Each structure stands twice: as structure tokens, then as C-alpha cells.
Amino acid sequence: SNANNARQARVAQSYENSYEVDSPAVRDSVLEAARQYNTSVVGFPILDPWLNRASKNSGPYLDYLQQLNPQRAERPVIASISIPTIDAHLPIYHGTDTATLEHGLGHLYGSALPVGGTGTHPVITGHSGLANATLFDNLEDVKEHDPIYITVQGETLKYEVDAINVVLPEDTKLLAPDPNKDQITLITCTPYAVNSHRLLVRAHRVDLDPNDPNL
């Protein structure tokens, strides 16, 4: 297809772009643009990612896909996450479509991008129960006070778990941003072979000791 040719050409072009957008000053401006984006989506409604699909050719969604993507790739990794107490180390991608969640964690459209800052609440989504990848199967083992490390554009952000809740999919109040807090939530479905509910592991930003063993 023309689709495939275009896809191959874009892989080439983004490889080339990546050597022109990786300087400290461009990482800083990509991150600053992500913060501006986060301010602009503060009111957005937040839909369940297993039960709904985002409108992926809308204008704002196409804009979202340009954030954290100075190379202009298709489906780039936007950040990584590490949860060493359950030995998880996984890439995060834009959105939560079916193919994304088979190969990594998805970022829930309508929530802040995971670049830190007060007033933000990124929601990072993973399957549990997918054949042949662990993903968030062990999120239910995470405990209060466990650390979470996000890496994004060369920066490392540290979060500590503070709440663990199980809720119905319609109920997203625990996902609200709070203008005075820098938080993230990890979400997966539960229980095993049913997935009628959502497990929400919330964490808040803490200082990163430069000598953290987990770095």
C-alpha cells in the first residue's frame, strides 16, 4: 500500500530528525511545550480506556500525537517507567488503543502528559491478563510508599505510592487533577478473567536523591 511506503519513509525521516532534536535546548522546549499542553487539557473529560475509544482523527488528538515527539515518528515511546518493587520496566506510548496496549503502556488521552508539575495527573494504562506479556499483571503487588520512576526527554521523575483503590469503570473521581499536587495514577483492570473493575495506584512527586540506588 501507499500506507506502507509512507510508513517506511517516515521511519527514515524520523531517524534523520532524531539527530537534530536531541540537544539539551530542544529537550527543554519539548518539555516546556508539554507543560503548556497540560495546562490546556486540565478540564478534559476522562473516559475508560477499555470501554471507550478516543476520536483518533480529531484535531486535538492529532495535536496530542505531536507532543513528546520532536522526531515526528509514528507511535514513538513518549516516556518510560520503572517500578522496581515489582520488577517492571516498560515503555509508555500515546493513547490507549488496542495495539498500543499489546506492546506497552498507554497514556490516557485527556490526562496530563507525564512531565511533572503541580496541577497535573497523568494516567498510565496497562493490561493485566494479556497472554504472553506481563505488563501490569503485578500492579496489585505494589504497596504504599513504593517508588515509581518516570524518564522523559532525558529527565527522571520520582513518585511515591500513596493510595490504592479499586473502582468501577464509570467512576473516575480519583483521577481528577488537583491544582496543588503533582500526581500520577497507574490503572489496570481487575479481577482476573473478569475485568469488571479498575485498580488505581496513585502516587505523588517526591525529591529525587541523585544517589538513589534504583537509578
Place this chain on the structure above:
Amino acid sequence: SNANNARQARVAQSYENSYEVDSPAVRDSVLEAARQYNTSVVGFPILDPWLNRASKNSGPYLDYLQQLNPQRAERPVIASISIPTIDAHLPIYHGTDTATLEHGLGHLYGSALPVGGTGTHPVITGHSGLANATLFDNLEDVKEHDPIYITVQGETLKYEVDAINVVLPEDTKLLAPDPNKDQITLITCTPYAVNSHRLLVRAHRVDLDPNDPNL
């Protein structure tokens, strides 16, 4: 599988590594290591990539896979190529296995890496006739004097076509390195629906005018 988990974890780790290996000094040392590698493989035999398979778990092959890969990814793009007279813009990957050649161009193991230098002769391989990607279908339209641009670790190399030959697969004499020349060959199979022969488009290095319209 554990294989999938490991693959996902490595995607995360290489995303993180990519922000630590992209400085000018590391691009220079990756390129210098590639030149050293090229010197070490000057005598290697060169097998037809459609008719043979490299031993992909041998020691030297695993070393090859670490070249042009400071991020330590699985199957990274190692370089891109542009041939504007046939409107081709494609990524190049290590090796020439089946899955590589479905998604881009492959680099023929045993030939120099495409980083330039006298005494080198990289061979870049593409299919013709694959359903649903053009790849090297139009290589047969390339003419003498046409330019070829390789981009690698942020550098751009310009080559100009000087020979076009059709040969049998066993016959690789036109692929020999020449200690006084900086050359590349593009190879595909021919003719349509038969692929009994190989089309070899050879080009030599020329000065890159910084104001080349094709940049």
C-alpha cells in the same frame, strides 16, 4: 513469553539510553568504532542474501549488531538512504533477514558499514516485487550520475552512481572493496517474477555541497 517481556523492557531501556548517547562526542566515537569495524571485516566472504542466511548467533554477528547502536536497541535503524531521482527514502537495518527486508533495506553482513572511508564497500539490499511496499522496485530506473544520500549518526554522505550491472547471484566480484575507493552498491533481484539475477547499482563518494537542493 519471557521473550516478549524482555523485548518490552529493552524498548524502555533503549529509549532511556538514547538521551545519553546522542551528544556530538558519542556520535563521533560510534562512527570511529564503525570505521575500525570496517577495517576488521575487509577480508570477509560475502554471500547472496536471498540464497543464504547469516549465522545470527555467532560471536562476530552479535558484535556487528552492536555497531551503529549505542542505544542498544533490538533492530534499530542504522542509517537512512535517499535516492531522489526515483523518489526513494528508506531506512537501513542490520542484516538481511526475511523480516528486515519486509520493512526496509538491509545491510549485507560481511560488507562495510555505510559510514564512508576509502577501502570500504557497503552493500545495501532491498527487495523488488514485494506486495505492498515499493522498496527497490524502481532501482532499475536509477541512472549513471544520479545522487545517493546516506545519513548516519547525524552525518550526510553523498555518492554518485557510476556502474549498473546485472549478474548471477554466485558472482560477487563487483562487490569487492578497493583499498583506494569509497564506494557503495545497491542490490536487488531481477527480473520481475523470476529473481534469478541481481541488479547491482554502484556509486562512489563525492563532495557534498552544503547547499545541495536535495538536502
